[PDB]
């Protein structure tokens, strides 16, 4: 529920720790258009503890959320946000046309159109340095086939769903190899021997 969300070229990571995480208040809300888990199932989150908790957060079009699924390929999955293949965690998304689309075309939001190579899982990359798409060397800020490596979404509320902007969160976490620090709302009991 933060005021503003990042462009997917600069997705914001919040580390969650030393606290009780009730997930019922997330999963039981209809206010999320998607809640898809991988290495766990959504109803089971309250039956677990987590050794760290990760909440990567950004915006993207409704018609590219499919690429956020782990081990896929395509511009988002290849150049701007990579999940590791064993991803244990859940992906959350909701429409944001009424908070984050604009009739001018909301050019506040960018993504990495080009890059040197496929980025590592959870690598993040702000670099504006010009991409040399054809086999020429290229200097300064411009040239034929020399691309500024970010491109912008057109977001207008008159554009349809799939064109519209979504806020997205990925809850990434790790289990049973380390000390717990986040746990479910479940209550303890007097330890018999």
């Amino acid at each position: 529920n933060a005021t503003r969300f990042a462009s997917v070229y600069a997705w914001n990571r919040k580390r969650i720790s030393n606290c009780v995480a009730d997930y019922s208040v997330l999963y039981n809300s209809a206010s999320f258009s998607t809640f898809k888990c991988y290495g766990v199932s959504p109803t089971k989150l309250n039956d677990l503890c987590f050794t760290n908790v990760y909440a990567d957060s950004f915006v993207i079009r409704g018609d590219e959320v499919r690429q956020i699924a782990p081990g896929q390929t395509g511009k988002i999955a290849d150049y701007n946000y990579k999940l590791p293949d064993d991803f244990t965690g859940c992906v959350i998304a909701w429409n944001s046309n009424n908070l984050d689309s604009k009739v001018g075309g909301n050019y506040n939001y960018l993504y990495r159109l080009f890059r040197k190579s496929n980025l590592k899982p959870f690598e993040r990359d702000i670099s504006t340095e010009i991409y040399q798409a054809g086999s020429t060397p290229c200097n300064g800020v411009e040239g034929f086939n020399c691309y500024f490596p970010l491109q912008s979404y057109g977001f207008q509320p008159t554009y349809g769903v799939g064109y519209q902007p979504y806020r997205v969160v990925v809850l990434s976490f790790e289990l049973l190899h380390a000390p717990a620090t986040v746990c479910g709302p479940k209550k303890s009991t007097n330890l018999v021997k």
Partner: protein, 48 residues
């Protein structure tokens, strides 16, 4: 090729059908590992 080798960890982290597909892997492998042991054992019993 399951998420884990701990059977109670798979049953904690997943529901009735997502746990089932993952447990069937452990059943397959474990069955094959115990069959390999019983084959080595019957052959060693014939030597002894």
């Amino acid at each position: 090729g399951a998420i884990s080798s701990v059977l109670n960890d798979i049953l904690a982290r997943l529901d009735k059908v997502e746990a089932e597909v993952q447990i069937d892997r452990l059943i397959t492998g474990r069955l094959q590992s115990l069959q390999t042991y019983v084959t080595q054992q019957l052959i060693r019993a014939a030597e002894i």
